[PDB]
Amino acid sequence: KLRGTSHMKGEYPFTITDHGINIFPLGAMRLTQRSSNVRVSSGVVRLDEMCGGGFFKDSIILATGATGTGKTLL
Amino acid sequence: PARIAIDSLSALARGVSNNAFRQFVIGVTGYAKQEEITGLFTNTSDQFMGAHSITDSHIDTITDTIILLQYVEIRGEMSRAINVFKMRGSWHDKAIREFMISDKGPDIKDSFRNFERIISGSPTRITVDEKSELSRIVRGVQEKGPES
Amino acid sequence: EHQAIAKMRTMIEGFDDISHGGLPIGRSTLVSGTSGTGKTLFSIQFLYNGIIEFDEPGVFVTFEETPQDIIKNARSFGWDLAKLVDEGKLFILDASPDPEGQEVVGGFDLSALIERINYAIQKYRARRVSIDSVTSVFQQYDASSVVRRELFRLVARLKQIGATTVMTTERIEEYGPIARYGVEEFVSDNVVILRNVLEGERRRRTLEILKLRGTSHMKGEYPFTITDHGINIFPLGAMRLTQRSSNVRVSSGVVRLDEMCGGGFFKDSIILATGATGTGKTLLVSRFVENACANKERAILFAYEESRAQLLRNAYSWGMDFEEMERQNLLKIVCAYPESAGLEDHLQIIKSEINDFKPARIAIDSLSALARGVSNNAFRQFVIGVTGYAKQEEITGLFTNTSDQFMGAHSITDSHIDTITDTIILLQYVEIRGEMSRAINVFKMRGSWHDKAIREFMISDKGPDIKDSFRNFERIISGSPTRITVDEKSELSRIVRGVQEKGPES
Amino acid sequence: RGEMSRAINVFKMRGSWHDKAIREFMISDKGPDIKDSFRNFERIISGSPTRITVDEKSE
Ligand SMILES: Nc1ncnc2c1ncn2[C@@H]1O[C@H](COP(=O)(O)OP(=O)(O)OP(=O)(O)O)[C@@H](O)[C@H]1O
Ligand SMILES: Nc1ncnc2c1ncn2[C@@H]1O[C@H](COP(=O)(O)OP(=O)(O)OP(=O)(O)O)[C@@H](O)[C@H]1O
Ligand SMILES: Nc1ncnc2c1ncn2[C@@H]1O[C@H](COP(=O)(O)OP(=O)(O)OP(=O)(O)O)[C@@H](O)[C@H]1O
Ligand SMILES: [Mg+2]
Ligand SMILES: [Mg+2]
Ligand SMILES: [Mg+2]
Ligand SMILES: [Mg+2]
Ligand SMILES: [Mg+2]
Ligand SMILES: [Mg+2]
């Protein structure tokens, strides 16, 4: 509590390092990430063609599959 | 870095609770999203073939583009296959392709067109009279055209 | 009203509903809870409101906080108790001990205090009274039996005086005893309990009325939030089922669909769009929000999966420029991580934003996003909320739900919200010849007729294209169909040879 | 054919190339005698296969 004002409610994980306390407001970060129309290769030209030209520079790419399928390669 | 990659988020979700994982993901995800860093995350589905869900941990939603690898039982042999399941900004291919791994790398060949139930890993080969119709012996209407 | 007890209005949002009218007049209500639970706000706000809406001067007794501080803090929400104390509408009565004190004084002071309070009320002609943390008073050196007697006295003098008091109290455990000494619970006329349940790192505050000696009220815990406006409770169970229903129609942003929908969605309906990840629920919503703007209506989009930036890249790639939509002051996008608050909070942020903008169309992209980690009973209860609000407000709704398993989903929703929604538009993948193809289906419409066809649809730069169904297919829902042909080649436009042209001319 | 026959397979080899076939294999006083694959079966992995015996192309 902070009699008199507002704040963020809940627990928050922080880490004691060589630079003291470091708290990560994993709920404070805002949904204002920058997004463009740029492309980038992958290391696989054909894959680049299937994806439509290439992975966007601004994005997250996920690679699923059973053990041994070859994500580590990609 | 301009590009970051984490091999097996599936490794990090070992033991740790779900909610605590999803939190980590959102974390390493958004920091890379706002900082202009392209990132490739690796997930290993606990069960080869027959996997009914993209990720056991249900992260698939917090992602932009999904690339999927999955074994396909073909004639007593375990072959790979790849699919750009989804991409938010682009068009991307909808063909579940085959692919070999060599000393050179990943060669993405064709799709399994003559099959059914591919996603289940153990597909059903099904040509038995390919698209040329029972008229491969074209009936016999064409018996008038050539003469003397 | 049929209630043997005449109640007084707190004017705190929804408390009155929960208490079926507000506090009983001439009695005392124990409002207790742990630390930072809302006690002092409630009390303060209880006096305030009686002052601003009924000109009912009030007396506020403090045992720990300083009279300067109760004023200082009270500005946080935007009230000037100062001025009120100036007009003599609010007398603050300081009973905090001193920074340079002694030891011993809690019985003849309880008598002196009663005699004190009687005065202030007599002098200010007050009708409302608060007593903050009586607990801290016996917190000098006492035991159960001495408290009960000393409370009883105060309460009894208060009721003889005819005052409608409110006493705050502390507890240690969120679910254990109600009060500290475990005696306040039985000497009060009414008991209001405030909790700040931790549970999974987040924090949820609820308000409960255990008892009102004399009347009915709303049983159980009810969520509430503290904001720049004070306390705010949501009677998620008091929300009656008497929402208006019309036969009007509204586009879906996509024509073919509309057809499929008997003629465009109902103005008064909750719309559910399920399907595997990547099926294009997001797309559809974008069109649904767009169309309202193309017709000059206001609509909000609450996105819990995509950034406001990305939401625009993709929206443009699908044609439809959201930029303008923001400019013409017709579309308003929100964006919020579900982990950036609890359900009680998100529910209100939505409502609020729904008021400051008066949408006609609302679209929450990914309810299954909000379902992350929450207990189903807590989620279902959220859904009912947003949904309900939207229904009783004539605001069409388009909700989105993503299924945990692509292809092979034996259920519309994993949270079984199915029956809350009025219309359902389904999306899924179809492994047709080594290829993942999209298929759209209008599963159910409550008031219309809607097509019963599982049409294939392809996504393009222009957007959604609704073709035809895989008639010659069995096990379609299986995700990976089987193809049986009694025909196919059948008419439609046989005539072989050279049927086409090419890019040159036709 | 109503018999519990074994099969071996190198599922994944990180460095090497390893064979991809699912090979039949028996056991005797000599040890493991790996045989041929089930080239003409479907759903081996599942355990309860299904011979294809495709009518070739049927001429
Ligand atoms: N030099 C190579 N030549 C042919 N095939 C190879 C070669 N190296 C690896 N492979 C094949 O690729 C697979 C290796 O998988 P990969 O390293 O891509 O990562 P993964 O499947 O995502 O994760 P993990 O390595 O833990 O299994 C092997 O199962 C094997 O069949
Ligand atoms: N403007 C505000 N907006 C949002 N929250 C606020 C605001 N002002 C105060 N709060 C919150 O309200 C709480 C204040 O509690 P309050 O002073 O009403 O009584 P209490 O915690 O029940 O008892 P005590 O006075 O002993 O702490 C704090 O926990 C704080 O986080
Ligand atoms: N410009 C485009 N052209 C062709 N297809 C596109 C285009 N944009 C997106 N798509 C397709 O639509 C999908 C994007 O999904 P969409 O944003 O519509 O929401 P969703 O699938 O319902 O939910 P989520 O995006 O959270 O997975 C991609 O996977 C892709 O196949
Ligand atoms: Mg692996
Ligand atoms: Mg690996
Ligand atoms: Mg998604
Ligand atoms: Mg306190
Ligand atoms: Mg207090
Ligand atoms: Mg989405």
Numbering used by the authors:
A (entry chain A): 224 to 297
B (entry chain A): 372 to 519
C (entry chain F): 14 to 519
D (entry chain B): 446 to 504
What does the study report here?
The circadian clock of the cyanobacterium Synechococcus elongatus can be reconstituted in vitro by three proteins, KaiA, KaiB and KaiC. Homo-hexameric KaiC displays kinase, phosphatase and ATPase activities; KaiA enhances KaiC phosphorylation and KaiB antagonizes KaiA. The crystal structure of KaiC from S. elongatus revealed a hexamer in the shape of a double doughnut with approximate dimensions 100×100 Å, whereby the N-terminal CI and C-terminal CII halves of subunits are joined by a 15-amino acid linker. Two phosphorylation sites (P-sites), T432 and S431 that are both located in the CII half were identified in KaiC.
To analyze the phosphorylation patterns of KaiC P-site mutants and to visualize potential conformational variations in the vicinity of bound ATP and residues 432 and 431 at hexamer subunit interfaces, we determined crystal structures of the S. elongatus KaiC single mutants T432A (TSa), S431A (TaT), S431D (TdT), and T426N (nST) and the double mutants T426A/T432A (aSa) and S431A/T432E (Tae). b KaiC mutations xyz or mutants KaiCxyz are sequentially shown in order of sites x = 426, y = 431, and z = 432 where the wild-type residue is in upper case and mutated residues are shown in lower case, i.e. Tsa or KaiCTSa, where the residue at position 426 is T, the residue at position 431 is S, and the residue at position 432 is mutated to A. The structures of the TdT, nST and aSa mutants provide further support for the conclusion that T432 is the principal phosphorylation site because it lies closest to the γ-phosphate. The combined structural data expose subtle changes in the orientations of the H423-I433 loop region harboring phosphorylated residues relative to the γ-phosphate of ATP compared with the structure of wt-KaiC.
